[PDB]
Amino acid sequence: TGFLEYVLNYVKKGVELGGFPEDFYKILSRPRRVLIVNIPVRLDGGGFEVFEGYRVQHCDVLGPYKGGVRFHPEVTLADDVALAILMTLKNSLAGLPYGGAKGAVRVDPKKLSQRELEELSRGYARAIAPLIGDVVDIPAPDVGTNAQIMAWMVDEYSKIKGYNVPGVFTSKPPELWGNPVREYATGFGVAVATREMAKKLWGGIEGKTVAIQGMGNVGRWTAYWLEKMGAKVIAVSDINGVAYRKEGLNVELIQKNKGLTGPALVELFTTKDNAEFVKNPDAIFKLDVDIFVPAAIENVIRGDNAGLVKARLVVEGANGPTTPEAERILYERGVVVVPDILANAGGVIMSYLEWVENLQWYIWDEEETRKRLENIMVNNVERVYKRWQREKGWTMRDAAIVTALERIYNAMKIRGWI
Amino acid sequence: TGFLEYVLNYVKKGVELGGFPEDFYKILSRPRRVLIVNIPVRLDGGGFEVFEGYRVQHCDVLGPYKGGVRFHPEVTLADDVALAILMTLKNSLAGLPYGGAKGAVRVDPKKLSQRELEELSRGYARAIAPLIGDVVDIPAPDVGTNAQIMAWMVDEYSKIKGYNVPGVFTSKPPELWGNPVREYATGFGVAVATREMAKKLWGGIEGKTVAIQGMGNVGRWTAYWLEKMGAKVIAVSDINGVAYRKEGLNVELIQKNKGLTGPALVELFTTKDNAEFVKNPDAIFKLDVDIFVPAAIENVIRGDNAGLVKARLVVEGANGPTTPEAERILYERGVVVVPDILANAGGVIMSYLEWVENLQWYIWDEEETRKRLENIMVNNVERVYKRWQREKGWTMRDAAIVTALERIYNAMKIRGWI
Amino acid sequence: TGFLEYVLNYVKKGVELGGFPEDFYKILSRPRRVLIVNIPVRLDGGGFEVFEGYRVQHCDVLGPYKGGVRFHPEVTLADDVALAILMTLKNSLAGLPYGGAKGAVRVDPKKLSQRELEELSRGYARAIAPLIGDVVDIPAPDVGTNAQIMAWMVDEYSKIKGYNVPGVFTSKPPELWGNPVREYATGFGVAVATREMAKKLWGGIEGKTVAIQGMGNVGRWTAYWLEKMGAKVIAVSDINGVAYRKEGLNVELIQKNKGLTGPALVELFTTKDNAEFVKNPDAIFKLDVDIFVPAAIENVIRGDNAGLVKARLVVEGANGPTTPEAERILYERGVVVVPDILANAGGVIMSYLEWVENLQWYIWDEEETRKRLENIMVNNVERVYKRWQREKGWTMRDAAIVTALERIYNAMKIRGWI
Amino acid sequence: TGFLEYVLNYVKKGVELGGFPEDFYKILSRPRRVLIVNIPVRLDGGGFEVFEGYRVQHCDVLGPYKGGVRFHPEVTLADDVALAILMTLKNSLAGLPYGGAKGAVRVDPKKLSQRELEELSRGYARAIAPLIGDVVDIPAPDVGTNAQIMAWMVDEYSKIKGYNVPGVFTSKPPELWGNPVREYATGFGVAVATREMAKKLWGGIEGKTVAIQGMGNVGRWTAYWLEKMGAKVIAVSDINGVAYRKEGLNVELIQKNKGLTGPALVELFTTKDNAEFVKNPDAIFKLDVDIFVPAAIENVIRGDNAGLVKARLVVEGANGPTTPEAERILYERGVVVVPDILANAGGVIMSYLEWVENLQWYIWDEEETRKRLENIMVNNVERVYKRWQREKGWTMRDAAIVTALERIYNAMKIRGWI
Ligand SMILES: NC(=O)c1ccc[n+]([C@@H]2O[C@H](COP(=O)([O-])OP(=O)(O)OC[C@H]3O[C@@H](n4cnc5c(N)ncnc54)[C@H](O)[C@@H]3O)[C@@H](O)[C@H]2O)c1
Ligand SMILES: NC(=O)c1ccc[n+]([C@@H]2O[C@H](COP(=O)([O-])OP(=O)(O)OC[C@H]3O[C@@H](n4cnc5c(N)ncnc54)[C@H](O)[C@@H]3O)[C@@H](O)[C@H]2O)c1
Ligand SMILES: NC(=O)c1ccc[n+]([C@@H]2O[C@H](COP(=O)([O-])OP(=O)(O)OC[C@H]3O[C@@H](n4cnc5c(N)ncnc54)[C@H](O)[C@@H]3O)[C@@H](O)[C@H]2O)c1
Ligand SMILES: NC(=O)c1ccc[n+]([C@@H]2O[C@H](COP(=O)([O-])OP(=O)(O)OC[C@H]3O[C@@H](n4cnc5c(N)ncnc54)[C@H](O)[C@@H]3O)[C@@H](O)[C@H]2O)c1
DSSP letters, D31-91, are: -SEEEEEEEEEE-SSS-EEEEEEEEEE---SSSSEEEEEEE-TT--HHHHHHHHHHHHHHH
The DSSP line for A384-405 is: HHHHHHTSSS--HHHHHHHHHH
- In angstroms, the separation between the Cα of residue B38 and the nearest Cα of chain A is 6
Give the residue from B397, B252, D417 showing the smallest Cα distance to A156: D417
Same domain flag for D221 and D167: no
Q: Which protein residue has the closest C-alpha to ligand 3 atom 15?
A: C217
Distance (Å, rounded) from C-alpha B122 to C-alpha B145? 13
Q: What CATH number has the domain bearing residue A105? A: 3.40.50.10860
CA angle B227, B230, B236 (to 5 degrees): 35
- Please, which experimental method was used? X-ray
Residue A129: which residues within 8 A CB-CB, separation 6 or more? A157, A160, C162
**φ/ψ (deg, to 5) at D225:** -65, -30
Torsion of CA B75, B77, B80, B81, to 10 degrees: -170
Same domain flag for C37 and C109: yes
Q: Is residue C19 part of a domain?
A: no
Residue C84: which residues within 8 A CB-CB, separation 6 or more? C31, C56, C57, C58, C67, C100, C101, C102
Q: Residue C280: how many CB atoms within 10 A of its CB?
A: 12
Same domain flag for A139 and A198: no
Burial D325-356 (b: 16+ CB within 10 A, else e): ebbebbbeeebbbbbbbbbbbbbbbbbbbbbb
Domain boundary among C156, C176, C196: C176
Report chain D's terminal Cα–Cα distance, integer Å.
27
Domain boundary among A122, A150, A176: A176
Q: Taking each helix axis as running N to C, give the angle between helix D2-17 and helix D77-93, from 0 to 180 degrees, rounded to the nearest 10.
A: 30
Give the residue from D166, D168, D185 showing the smallest Cα distance to D177: D166
Same domain flag for B162 and B185: no
Distance (Å, rounded) from C-alpha B322 to C-alpha B317? 11
Residue D279: which residues within 8 A CB-CB, separation 6 or more? D241
Q: Which amino acid is at C90?
A: K
Strands across the sheet with D291-294, in order?
D241-244, D232-238, D209-213, D291-294, D313-315, D336-338
| Bridge partners of residue D65, in order along the sequence | D137
Distance (Å) from CA B222 to ligand 2 centroid: 12
Give the residue from B291, B282, B292 showing the smallest Cα distance to B238: B282
Distance (Å, rounded) from C-alpha D47 to C-alpha D42? 6
Side-chain-facing half-sphere of A309: CA atoms under 13 Å: 31
Residue D154: which residues within 8 A CB-CB, separation 6 or more? D125, D165, D166, D168, D169, D172, D176
Q: Which domain holds residue D68?
A: 33-176
Q: What CATH number has the domain bearing residue A247? A: 3.40.50.720
Q: B346 in ligand 2 pocket by Cβ < 6 Å?
A: no
Q: Do chains D and B touch (3 or more CB pairs under 8 A)?
A: no
Q: Is residue A404 part of a domain?
A: yes
Chain centre to alpha carbon of residue B246? 31
Q: Return the DSSP state at B6.
A: H
Strands (E), C114-198: 137-138
Residue C355: which residues within 8 A CB-CB, separation 6 or more? C134, C138, C167, C170
The DSSP line for A133-175 is: BTTTEEEE--TT--HHHHHHHHHHHHHHHTS--GGGS-S--TT
Task: Decide: helix, strand or coil at residue C61.
Answer: coil
Pair C360, B360: CB distance under 8 Å: yes
Task: Decide: helix, strand or coil at residue A235.
Answer: strand
Q: Which amino acid is at C312?
A: R
| Run of H or E including A406 | helix A396-415
Residues of B known to be catalytic: 102
Strands (E), C129-231: 137-138, 209-213
Q: Is residue D346 part of a domain?
A: yes
Pair A213, A318: CB distance under 8 Å: yes
Q: Which protein residue has the closest C-alpha to ligand 1 atom 41?
A: A319
Chain C to chain D, count of Cβ pairs less than 8 Å apart?
63
Side-chain-facing half-sphere of D97: CA atoms under 13 Å: 23
Surface-to-core class of residue D49, CB atoms within 10 Å of its CB (0-12 exposed, 13-18 middle, 19+ buried): middle
| Bridge partners of residue A405, in order along the sequence | none
Q: Subunits that touch chain B (at least 3 Cβ pairs < 8 angstroms)?
A: A, C
Determine the length of chain C. Answer: 418
Residue B68 Cα distances to B32, B173, D36, D115, D355, angstroms: 17, 16, 49, 60, 50
Q: Which amino acid is at D157?
A: Y
Determine the length of chain D. Answer: 418
Q: Subunits that touch chain A (at least 3 Cβ pairs < 8 angstroms)?
A: B, C, D
Pair A184, A218: CB distance under 8 Å: no
- In angstroms, the separation between the Cα of residue D381 and the nearest Cα of chain A is 17
Sign of CA dihedral D289, D295, D297, D302: positive
D32 vs A contacts (CB less than 8 Å): none
Domain boundary among C124, C155, C176: C176
**φ/ψ (deg, to 5) at C294:** -80, 115
Pair D56, D101: CB distance under 8 Å: yes
- Residues near ligand 4 with C-beta < 6 Å? D 186, 213-219, 237-239, 262-263, 281, 295-297, 318-319, 344, 347
Q: B239 in ligand 2 pocket by Cβ < 6 Å?
A: yes
Same domain flag for B344 and B301: yes
D134: left (phi over 0), alpha (psi -120 to 50) or beta: alpha
Task: Decide: helix, strand or coil at residue C283.
Answer: helix
- In angstroms, the separation between the Cα of residue B118 and the nearest Cα of chain C is 29
Q: Is residue C13 part of a domain?
A: no
Distance (Å, rounded) from C-alpha C101 to C-alpha D37? 14
What are the contacts of A409-416 at 24+ separation with CB within 8 A? Answer: A409/A18, A409/A20, A409/A24, A411/A61, A411/A62, A412/A24, A412/A27, A412/A61, A415/A61
Distance (Å, rounded) from C-alpha B1 to C-alpha C57? 55
Torsion of CA A111, A114, A117, A121, to 10 degrees: 160
Pair D227, D219: CB distance under 8 Å: no
| Run of H or E including A348 | helix A346-359
Q: Residue B160: how many CB atoms within 10 A of its CB?
A: 14
- In angstroms, the separation between the Cα of residue A341 and the nearest Cα of chain B is 27
Give the residue from D131, D314, D321, D298 showing the smallest Cα distance to D211: D314
Contact across the interface for D136 and A163, Cβ inside 8 Å = yes
Determine the length of chain B. Answer: 418
Distance (Å, rounded) from C-alpha D162 to C-alpha A158? 25
C104: left (phi over 0), alpha (psi -120 to 50) or beta: beta
Distance (Å, rounded) from C-alpha D4 to C-alpha D327? 21
Residue A156 Cα distances to A149, A160, A174, D416, angstroms: 11, 6, 18, 10
Give the residue from B303, B374, B305 showing the smallest Cα distance to B345: B374
Distance (Å, rounded) from C-alpha A95 to C-alpha A345? 10
Residue D66: which residues within 8 A CB-CB, separation 6 or more? D87, D91, D96, D98, D99, D100, D101, D137, D138, D140, D348, D351, D352
Same domain flag for D139 and D188: no
Residue C199 Cα distances to A42, B303, C341, C384, angstroms: 60, 69, 20, 14
Pair A150, A177: CB distance under 8 Å: no
Contact across the interface for C129 and A160, Cβ inside 8 Å = no
**φ/ψ (deg, to 5) at B350:** -60, -40
Give the residue from D246, D381, D237, D224 showing the smallest Cα distance to D315: D381
Distance (Å, rounded) from C-alpha A125 to C-alpha A130? 9
Surface-to-core class of residue A246, CB atoms within 10 Å of its CB (0-12 exposed, 13-18 middle, 19+ buried): exposed
Q: Which of B64, B360, B410 sits opposite C175 (nearest CB)?
A: B410
Same domain flag for C134 and C212: no
B40 vs A contacts (CB less than 8 Å): 26-27, 417
* Nearest atom, ligand 1, residue A298 CA: 41
Same domain flag for C233 and C369: yes
Residue C281 Cα distances to B416, C240, C243, angstroms: 41, 7, 10
* Nearest atom, ligand 1, residue A186 CA: 1
| Bridge partners of residue A71, in order along the sequence | A105
Task: Decide: helix, strand or coil at residue A183.
Answer: helix
Same domain flag for B220 and B335: yes
Q: Is residue D5 part of a domain?
A: no
Distance (Å, rounded) from C-alpha B20 to C-alpha B12? 10
C322: left (phi over 0), alpha (psi -120 to 50) or beta: beta
Residue B74: which residues within 8 A CB-CB, separation 6 or more? none
Distance (Å, rounded) from C-alpha A350 to C-alpha A364? 12
β pairing state of B209-213 and B137-140: unpaired
Q: C357 in ligand 3 pocket by Cβ < 6 Å?
A: no
What are the contacts of D373-379 at 24+ separation with CB within 8 A? Answer: D373/D181, D373/D185, D373/D188, D373/D189, D373/D192, D373/D346, D373/D349, D374/D188, D374/D192, D376/D94, D376/D95, D376/D96, D376/D349, D377/D189, D377/D192, D377/D193, D377/D196, D377/D345, D377/D346, D377/D349, D378/D192, D378/D196, D379/D95
Same domain flag for B162 and B255: no
- In angstroms, the separation between the Cα of residue A130 and the nearest Cα of chain B is 8
Task: Decide: helix, strand or coil at residue A76.
Answer: coil
Q: Which of D27, D34, D36 sits opposite C50 (nearest CB)?
A: D27
Same domain flag for D276 and D136: no
Same domain flag for C292 and C409: yes
Strands (E), C238-369: 242-244, 276-278, 291-294, 313-315, 336-338
Task: Decide: helix, strand or coil at residue A309.
Answer: coil
Distance (Å) from CA D186 to ligand 4 centroid: 11
Q: Which of B30, B36, B52 sits opposite A52 (nearest CB)?
A: B30
Distance (Å, rounded) from C-alpha D299 to C-alpha D308? 15
Q: How many domains does chain D have?
A: 2
Chain C positions touching chain A (beta carbons under 8 Å): 126, 129-130, 159-160, 162
Q: Which amino acid is at A241?
A: G
Torsion of CA D81, D84, D86, D87, to 10 degrees: 170
Residue D403: which residues within 8 A CB-CB, separation 6 or more? D93, D383, D384, D387
Contact across the interface for C162 and A130, Cβ inside 8 Å = yes
Residue B216 Cα distances to A185, B147, B180, angstroms: 68, 17, 17
Distance (Å, rounded) from C-alpha B300 to C-alpha B279? 18
Pair D309, D330: CB distance under 8 Å: yes
Give the residue from C141, A127, C165, A156 showing the smallest Cα distance to B34: A127
Longest alpha-carbon distance in chain A: 65
Distance (Å, rounded) from C-alpha B352 to C-alpha B331? 33
Pair A128, A56: CB distance under 8 Å: no
Pair A53, A402: CB distance under 8 Å: no
Residue C302: which residues within 8 A CB-CB, separation 6 or more? C323, C325, C326
Q: Is residue C403 part of a domain?
A: yes
Pair D280, D241: CB distance under 8 Å: yes
Q: Is residue B13 part of a domain?
A: no
β pairing state of C336-338 and C313-315: parallel
**φ/ψ (deg, to 5) at A297:** -145, -170
Q: Which of A129, A160, A162 sits opposite C130 (nearest CB)?
A: A162
Pair B124, B153: CB distance under 8 Å: yes
Q: Choose the residue to mutate in D69, D238, D293, D351 for probing ligand 4, maximizing ligand atoms within 8 Å of C-beta.
A: D238
Residue D183: which residues within 8 A CB-CB, separation 6 or more? D221, D258
Q: Choose the residue to mutate in D279, D297, D298, D315 for probing ligand 4, maximizing ligand atoms within 8 Å of C-beta.
A: D297
Residues of D known to be catalytic: 102
Q: Choose the residue to mutate in B143, B218, B239, B340 for probing ligand 2, maximizing ligand atoms within 8 Å of C-beta.
A: B218
Q: Return the DSSP state at C208.
A: -
Annotated binding site of B for NAD(+), which residues? 186, 213, 217-218, 238-239, 319
Contact across the interface for B416 and C152, Cβ inside 8 Å = yes
Q: Residue B398: how many CB atoms within 10 A of its CB?
A: 19
Distance (Å, rounded) from C-alpha D13 to C-alpha D3? 16
The DSSP line for C1-30 is: -HHHHHHHHHHHHHHHHHT--HHHHHHHHS
